[PDB]
């Protein structure tokens, strides 16, 4: 009983979190009402990591839904699996945060954060041995970005010895709502540098390119983007949800993946990505899983070097052939793996494949090429900040220009820290 508490905050965080629970409830055989209707004991073996067991053999997700607007969470409660969530775990306000990090972090969000921590405390008190927390949110908005990072700070204060894990959606001008997204993301990244142990960087630029270039969707929607995120979130948490030896909990994953405390930002990847009945061989899974076109961070791994890599294969396949192809990729491109961390690629196999796939592969890479993501955000930040453009939305909430300058310096420091280990 190594429990995880899930938190989803803001519009993006709640829409992506809702799909995540829809996906893994299906994999574990949990129906939209909390009743288990599966056919394999592997489904219930580690079910308690994400689900509470209530009266009547009901499985209740250990999930807390947070937003400063009621709108999106009403759509979750009206969604397919909306009735499976604990009603008391819906914590929302009415003001919204207007895509404003200062409102989420300092004014509107501070008013609501205590009632979220009350729900977090109730879930933690019924945990046999809480591992830590996972948070889904975007960095470009106000609630998920500003209030989400405020939440993380206050969670760390009350549970300083627990792991903090986030799925963080990075903004991109390609898939943008407002021009202030680089401000919100830059302010949030520094919070994540200090207050998370593991962050999956999910780049909306990459999600768009994959939907358009690869999946052949000329007009991708947010729903299409979230299909890629759901499949990625299911893959990267397979080792937590099913029996296995490698990266079986959040702390062992962090010990395997994070050689330096600040460099804990991962590029996730998924294979296959098909626009569909054809069987995919193990060599094909391995080549696609490492292909840049399958990465969710919009960074070219050949532009940097892998510190650590986690690979997860799902389905009934030749584990011997899995080892051969994994060793084949490392031995044929060994220049992209740092030589000062021996055997930094770890592979795990799970027999249960995702829905609608005979087999699949999920990639989790700690690559120094991720600095291209932070460089990208830093340039967009500076393009406006050098003219103090749109700053009044933030100074009107009490913030000072110095806090933006310090956020700018902090992320450029992070970029430089990746650069020193790339050489």
């Amino acid at each position: 009983m190594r429990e995880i508490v899930h938190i989803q905050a803001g519009q993006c965080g709640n829409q992506i979190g809702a799909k995540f629970w829809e996906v893994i409830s299906d994999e574990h055989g949990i129906d939209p009402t909390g009743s288990y209707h599966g056919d394999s004991d592997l489904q219930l073996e580690r079910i308690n990591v994400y689900y509470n067991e209530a009266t009547g053999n009901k499985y209740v997700p250990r999930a807390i839904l947070v937003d400063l607007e009621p709108g999106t969470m009403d759509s979750v409660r009206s969604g397919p699996f909306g009735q499976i969530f604990r009603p008391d775990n819906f914590v929302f306000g009415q003001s919204g945060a207007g895509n404003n990090w200062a409102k989420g972090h300092y004014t509107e969000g501070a008013e609501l954060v205590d009632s979220v921590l009350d729900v977090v405390r109730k879930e933690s008190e019924s945990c046999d041995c809480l591992q830590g927390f996972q948070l889904t949110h975007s960095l470009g908005g106000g609630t998920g970005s500003g209030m989400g990072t405020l939440l993380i700070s206050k969670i760390r204060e009350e549970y300083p010895d627990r792991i903090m894990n986030t799925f963080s959606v990075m903004p991109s001008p390609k898939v943008s709502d407002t021009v202030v997204e680089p401000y919100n993301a830059t302010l949030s990244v520094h919070q994540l540098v200090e207050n998370t142990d593991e962050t999956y960087c999910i780049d909306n630029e990459a999600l768009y390119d994959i939907c358009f270039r690869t999946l052949k969707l000329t007009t991708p929607t947010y729903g299409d983007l979230n299909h890629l995120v759901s499949a990625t979130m299911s893959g990267v948490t397979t080792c937590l949800r099913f029996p296995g030896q490698l990266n079986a909990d959040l702390r062992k994953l962090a010990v395997n993946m994070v050689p330096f405390p600040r460099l804990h930002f991962f590029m996730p990847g998924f294979a296959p990505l098909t626009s569909q009945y054809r069987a995919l061989t193990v060599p094909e899974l391995t080549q696609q899983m490492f292909d840049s076109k399958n990465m969710m961070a919009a960074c070219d791994p050949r532009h940097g070097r892998y510190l650590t890599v986690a690979a997860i294969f799902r389905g009934r396949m030749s584990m011997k052939e899995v080892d051969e192809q994994m060793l084949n990729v490392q031995n044929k491109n060994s220049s992209y793996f740092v030589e000062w961390i021996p055997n930094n690629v770890k592979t795990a196999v799970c027999d249960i494949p995702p829905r609608g796939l005979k087999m699949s592969a999920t990639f989790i890479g700690n690559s120094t090429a991720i600095q291209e993501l932070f460089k990208r955000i830093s340039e967009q930040f500076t393009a406006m900040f050098r003219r103090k453009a749109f700053l009044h939305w933030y100074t009107g909430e009490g913030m000072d220009e110095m806090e933006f300058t310090e956020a700018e310096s902090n992320m450029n420091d992070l970029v430089s820290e990746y650069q020193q280990y790339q050489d």
Partner: protein
Amino acid sequence: MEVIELNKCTSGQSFEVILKPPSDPSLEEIQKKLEAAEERRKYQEAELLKHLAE
């Protein structure tokens, strides 16, 4: 090639064959090191809570 010290019993036997002749910390000190490490953990957490209080 000498066989020496042959001992036989019901469940086996043993012997030696020669081919050529030749040519702690105390309980207190352990507790001190464990308590020193715990104090360094307490100091690092106190600095974290101080940083979060700021």
